[PDB]
Design a protein around this ligand. Structure first.
Ligand SMILES: Cc1c(C(=O)C2=C(O)CCCC2=O)ccc2c1c(=O)n([C@@H](C)c1ccccc1)c(=O)n2C
Ligand SMILES: Cc1c(C(=O)C2=C(O)CCCC2=O)ccc2c1c(=O)n([C@@H](C)c1ccccc1)c(=O)n2C
Ligand SMILES: [Co+2]
Ligand SMILES: [Co+2]
Lengths: 382, 382
């Protein structure tokens, strides 16, 4: 049941901003590893004396990488005279974020009808303000509230090309890489206590709990009216036969933050082939694959959805499969994206729920905890 | 004339250490962009709770990338009980270095006969100590003195595999990339005042001035006894028809630091082909190429050294050529390696001075300032 209680009009995920020490090297690594092209820039060459920001895109997916310059370059500036293209940026906030958490997501940005109204309504409904609404070139409005830890939810609204002050990247440095990734499906937070986290976010957005049904976690999913913005949140479950990956995250991240970005592919087979070819030459590594017992057990589970050849293609690529009441989910997880065992990426593709495909079709793979556990015990005894 | 005045026995360049915000992403980017393989690691998986350090190698060239973890992981440790594999490492020093300078070289490491003697002798002769000699596993000794700015000269000596506590990297993540780079030829500092810089370094090493003969700089080169360790230093020359790149460096770097690393290739043609193929897919960009007039003028200059086909191969790749009394130098420069217009890399190959090839054969390309200037004026008027 979807009560459609959004307190303001929400469209889709707009972009994800990483706060970096060096945006150039992170962005180039991500570009090669995920097959995203360099689409826009805001840096010294565009007049920005405050921060370096590089935008990668794949389909509708937008990854922004931002790092501060020396404050001495902009020492004479004040906010009214700033050359920053992202007015919410602050050197001290950025350095403190990165020193505290390492490389990770600062901003989960969603496009809304009117960022000013969304901001005012959110704060009126309990949201902690982070950056007030600011109009860029009388054309784009941006505002920010706290989401969890030091992650903000950023609202973006357009009167009618990424952001004013960003320049389109020259087609020469813009190699048209594409491994099939098309959009952000969901963005997941890790928190010490799930209850207060949910109550707070659902409080100021009107987002509703999304339908569901010892793995180290409890989780719940908040969704916008059309369930195209999906914000799962996890908390740890302490004490087991293995340590909670949520607890490990909080320890190495120095508290709550974004755990993983799930990127929808138009062809998860080709995406995973391309990413796996590049793992050891600058790209991303993937978690250890399930044993062959997991893939034998797939026939009994999704044999109606996936042919024997497509199941064997999942096995060759380490792809996991779960299923819902209405849809089927293919998923796989990278190793952590940086030095710390904190943020990682999920690649997914959803099968079913045709109406356009409805959001969350197939769930989030929670049934793969037991299915993975069972297959691992079976392969050991085998 | 080489007076051979080294105050201690110096062997060769050993490694270069970069201080990073995220060592993983910088190291993966450098690996792909330069064709260096992952050879050793010291991180959480090896028991290091203090810093993440990844070693890339190509031939004898060793690039180390190090970033701090959260201090909370090692809060109970003291230096006698440290899990750091590099005992000179300090969280606060590392974060302060990176916040101040951005991504850059912290340590220029040279192998010596006895790091303890080299340290004591250096400090006795004016060197400012940075980290005292420390014996690792009764097998490797390391010590550090200040070189310029926040760059240290690191001494390493071996009784008889990179460093104790580093683990060899699994041949699976160790893809055997190789674009032909073989060793560090020279490492270059930018300082506000050349005179005091030279006097200080030559004072404590015994390194001698290396033979030479408005471009924005003055420079001089310090060399070890066999002239295989080469340390040029630059200072700006203020006021011209263009701003000094040395001054730009000091401004964006917040003072003195390492300007460029020059990497010798066994085949600069293949190195530049491989690096240029990768520039727009995660690798490194190169400075703008000289006009065709520069390459026509090459026949009159090096036509005895390089055939017409090899000169045309230089033109296709943007390679610069200079010549000495005894040798010929092929060189090219990357764009800056990170966000700031500070550190860059030079690729070089030297022709001549056969005895083994003697160090510095062909010089450092100083004649290419005028040759580039002339050809640029000629191409404009053409
Ligand atoms: C993150 C994830 C999800 C996931 O997407 C997700 C949501 O979107 C929202 C609901 C909560 C949630 O979890 C689903 C299945 C996963 C994993 C996952 O992380 N892991 C590995 C990597 C692991 C488990 C334990 C300890 C260390 C690693 C899995 O095995 N499964 C099977
Ligand atoms: C660094 C360099 C060297 C070099 O290696 C070097 C040494 O090893 C020691 C002696 C001093 C020195 O300079 C040689 C030639 C160079 C460059 C160089 O940097 N440039 C570009 C990039 C540039 C010039 C001006 C303003 C901006 C950029 C050149 O054009 N030439 C021709
Ligand atoms: Co997920
Ligand atoms: Co040089």
């Amino acid at each position: 049941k979807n009560p459609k209680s959004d307190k303001f009009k929400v469209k889709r995920f707009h972009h994800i901003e990483f706060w970096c020490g060096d945006a150039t090297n992170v962005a180039r690594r991500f570009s090669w590893g995920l097959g995203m092209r360099f689409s826009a820039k805001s840096d010294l060459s565009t007049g920005n004396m405050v921060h370096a920001s590089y935008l990668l895109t794949s389909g509708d997916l937008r990854f922004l990488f931002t790092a501060p310059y020396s404050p001495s370059l902009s020492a004479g500036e004040i906010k009214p005279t700033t050359t920053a293209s992202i007015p919410s940026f602050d050197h001290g906030s950025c350095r403190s974020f990165f020193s505290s958490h390492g490389l990770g997501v600062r901003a989960v940005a969603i496009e809304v009808e009117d960022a000013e109204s969304a901001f005012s309504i959110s704060v009126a409904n309990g949201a902690i303000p982070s950056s007030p609404p600011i109009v860029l070139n009388e054309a784009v409005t941006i505002a920010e509230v706290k989401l969890y830890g030091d992650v903000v939810l950023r609202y973006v609204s357009y009167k009618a090309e990424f952001l004013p002050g960003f320049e389109r990247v020259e087609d020469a440095s813009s190699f048209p890489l594409d491994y099939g990734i098309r959009r952000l499906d969901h963005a997941v937070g890790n928190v010490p206590e799930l209850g207060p986290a949910l109550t707070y976010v659902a409080g100021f957005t009107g987002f509703h709990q999304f339908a569901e049904f010892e793995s180290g976690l409890n989780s719940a999913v908040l969704a916008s009216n059309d369930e195209m913005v999906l914000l799962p949140i996890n908390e740890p479950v302490h004490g087991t036969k293995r340590k909670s990956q949520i607890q490990t995250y909080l320890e190495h991240n120095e508290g709550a933050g974004l755990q993983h970005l799930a990127l929808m592919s138009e062809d998860i087979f080709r995406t995973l082939r391309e990413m796996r070819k590049r793992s050891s030459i600058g790209g991303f590594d993937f978690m250890p694959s399930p044993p062959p017992t997991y893939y034998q057990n797939l026939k009994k589970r999704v044999g109606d959805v996936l042919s024997d050849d497509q199941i064997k293609e999942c096995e060759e690529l380490g792809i996991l499969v779960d299923r819902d009441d209405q849809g089927t989910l293919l998923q796989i997880f990278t190793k952590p994206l940086g030095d710390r065992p904190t943020i990682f990426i999920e690649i997914i593709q959803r099968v079913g729920c045709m109406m356009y495909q409805s959001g969350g079709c197939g769930g989030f793979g929670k049934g793969n905890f037991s299915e993975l556990f069972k297959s691992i015990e079976e392969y050991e005894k085998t």
